[PDB]
Design an enzyme around this catalytic site. Structure first.
Site, short mmCIF file in Angstrom:
data_model
loop_
_atom_site.label_atom_id
_atom_site.label_comp_id
_atom_site.label_asym_id
_atom_site.label_seq_id
_atom_site.Cartn_x
_atom_site.Cartn_y
_atom_site.Cartn_z
N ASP A 113 -2.40 -5.01 10.50
CA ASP A 113 -2.57 -5.36 9.00
C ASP A 113 -2.39 -6.97 8.79
OD1 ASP A 113 -3.12 -4.99 6.28
OD2 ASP A 113 -1.69 -3.43 5.99
N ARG A 148 -1.14 -11.72 2.54
CA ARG A 148 -0.11 -10.91 1.71
C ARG A 148 0.92 -10.49 2.52
NH1 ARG A 148 -5.08 -8.32 2.58
NH2 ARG A 148 -4.53 -6.41 3.74
N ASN A 149 0.67 -10.06 3.91
CA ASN A 149 1.86 -9.56 4.92
C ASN A 149 2.69 -10.45 5.72
OD1 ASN A 149 -0.43 -6.89 5.10
ND2 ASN A 149 1.18 -7.00 3.80
N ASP A 204 5.52 -6.01 7.25
CA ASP A 204 4.81 -4.92 6.74
C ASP A 204 4.19 -4.01 8.20
OD1 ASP A 204 3.47 -2.82 5.24
OD2 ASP A 204 1.68 -3.84 4.84
N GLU A 253 0.79 -1.09 0.00
CA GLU A 253 -0.04 0.16 -0.16
C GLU A 253 0.77 1.47 0.03
N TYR A 291 15.66 -11.14 3.30
CA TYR A 291 14.94 -11.72 1.89
C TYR A 291 14.33 -13.28 2.36
CZ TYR A 291 14.63 -13.94 -2.64
OH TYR A 291 14.13 -14.84 -3.64
N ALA A 292 12.91 -13.22 2.21
CA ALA A 292 12.17 -14.45 2.20
C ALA A 292 12.09 -14.98 0.80
CB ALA A 292 10.92 -14.36 3.00
#
Ligand code: AMP
Ligand code: AMP
Lengths: 289, 289
Positions: free
Chosen positions: B151, B155-156, B169, B32, B104-105
């Site tokens: 949040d 997706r987070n 996030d 976002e 980094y994932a």
């Protein structure tokens, strides 16, 4: 809260259009809160047959803020009527996602339009002056309606049949009859490189800050859709603005045209021209070739 | 205003990393407020050679809100350390755009990860229970740190080497030591279908509303990345929630697992389990196969 109130108030007719008479097509683009598709509408407001239209809706996973923004834009577009402001035809709120049905501008956004062209589409300095003047005419009408647009930028002006400018994207526009300013406590959702210095630092929006944005819009027009403060990170804007720096005169820009942008960028809001002045300045450059 | 203060305060060292030792690559996605690129970092925090990292930055035409969000996330990631919370390594704020350099994932977001798989990647009900439990472990740590994430959504959550969950996030996360709630006057920028009923209607955020979101996250896990309240417009959420409706038990979901989601969705915040309970529930389902 304020939104559940709006949503219920809303859900519980000059403007309602039957969903089954609307057919949706390709995506035309996404803004900060909405997504726009090309559409066609059957028997829309006294027009026989189909009419090609644009439709605004919420994106996937819309937040309360985006929903409010869409209801807000709807509420502004109802009050507003001017040949250089995008025209609203209806909505579908009754049995599916909220959809706003507006006038279709066939050339899309002014940014895209300008970026596809070159200066001798081949556009003259006159055509660009003409574009700026139309937008300025629209702004004077809104300023008279007592509306602060807040988000004036080349991506938010559309180009319709005949290369007509349509001011667009009213999600963030605010009423200012009472006090002549809109002040927002939390952080604005408008890009920093288009905001007046006092909107940036003090969260004050007025017709005079719309003029600031218009100045940036002028820079965009004259550069054929260039990126403002190119290479400078938005966070450097605080200090660069308050120390009195502004964008350098771009190429293919007369002295008088650059004078008009600087003037839209004066630190003190009352030293900036009003849209009527801006209009009278662009007319004058037009007629002197 | 509050931001010009933050930006100057910021610009005027356990965390600063030299820009010239960072090399940027492909875009991994946009949230976002930020955009994330894959990156590599030379001589990062005692590690010899290059280290593959992810980098968060502002998008084109970032608004004051997005900049604040990015500074905020930075400020949260500094305080936070847990094997199921994404790890922060540094930043570049000194001579270019603001950049956050994080862990980094390799499998990306949990949503994408789950959507690419099927249930017998082939994932067992155990693997999904394991994923939910890791995230719950992370949430208990944050709730103990007195942080409301706000949040929480598939997706987070990121999936790292070993299929490890990383809560991600933090742009919207808030401190709640003082009062045990975060209350936001204007409209939240979190998707409506993941918000607790009291966050939707009353703008109150607590660890108990994070539990609500976790419940929606559980629905996402169990459905292998399905879309919540499918086919229902976000604006119908006000009324559907307040009349006591909830998502139906999805397929491939036991009775006890569905009981846990309903419980995360209780109207009254104090009737919802705390993350420690949630953890103890998922462990118990794990061991009973
Ligand atoms: N009436 C319209 N006709 C054609 N394209 C549009 C229209 N409204 C918006 N768009 C496109 O979709 C983008 C996002 O619109 P908005 O969400 O209003 O800023 C615009 O920048 C245009 O590219
Ligand atoms: N550390 C990371 N490693 C790999 N991908 C990431 C990482 N952080 C974010 N992403 C991707 O970029 C998207 C936006 O991130 P965010 O802006 O933090 O929500 C995520 O949904 C992921 O697809």
């Amino acid at each position: 809260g304020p939104l559940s109130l709006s949503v219920d108030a809303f859900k519980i007719p000059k403007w309602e259009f039957p969903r089954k008479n609307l057919v949706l097509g390709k995506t035309l683009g996404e803004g900060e809160f909405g997504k726009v598709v090309k559409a066609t509408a059957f028997h829309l407001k006294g027009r026989a047959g189909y009419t090609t239209v644009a439709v605004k809706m919420l994106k996937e996973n819309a937040s309360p803020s985006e929903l409010r923004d869409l209801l807000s834009e709807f509420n502004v577009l109802k009050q507003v009527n001017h040949p250089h402001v995008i025209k609203l035809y209806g909505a579908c709120s009754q049995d599916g996602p909220l959809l706003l049905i507006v006038e279709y501008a066939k050339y899309g956004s002014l940014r895209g339009f300008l970026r596809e062209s070159r200066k001798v589409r081949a556009l003259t300095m006159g055509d660009l002056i003409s574009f700026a003047w139309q937008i300025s005419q629209g702004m004077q009408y809104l300023a008279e309606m007592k509306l602060v647009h807040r988000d004036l930028a080349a991506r938010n002006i559309l180009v319709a049949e005949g290369r007509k400018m349509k001011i667009s994207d009213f999600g963030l526009s605010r009423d200012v009859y009472e006090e002549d300013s809109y002040v927002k406590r939390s952080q604005g959702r408008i890009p920093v490189k288009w905001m007046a210095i006092e909107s940036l630092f003090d969260h004050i929006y007025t017709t005079q800050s719309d003029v600031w944005s218009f100045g940036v819009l002028l820079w965009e027009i004259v550069t054929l859709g260039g990126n403002p403060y190119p290479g400078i990170p938005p966070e450097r804007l605080f200090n660069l603005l308050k120390t009195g720096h502004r964008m350098e005169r771009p190429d293919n820009c007369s002295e008088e045209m650059y004078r008009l942008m600087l003037q839209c960028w004066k630190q003190e809001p009352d030293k900036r021209p009003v849209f009527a002045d801006i209009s009278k300045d662009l007319e004058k450059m037009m007629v002197k070739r």
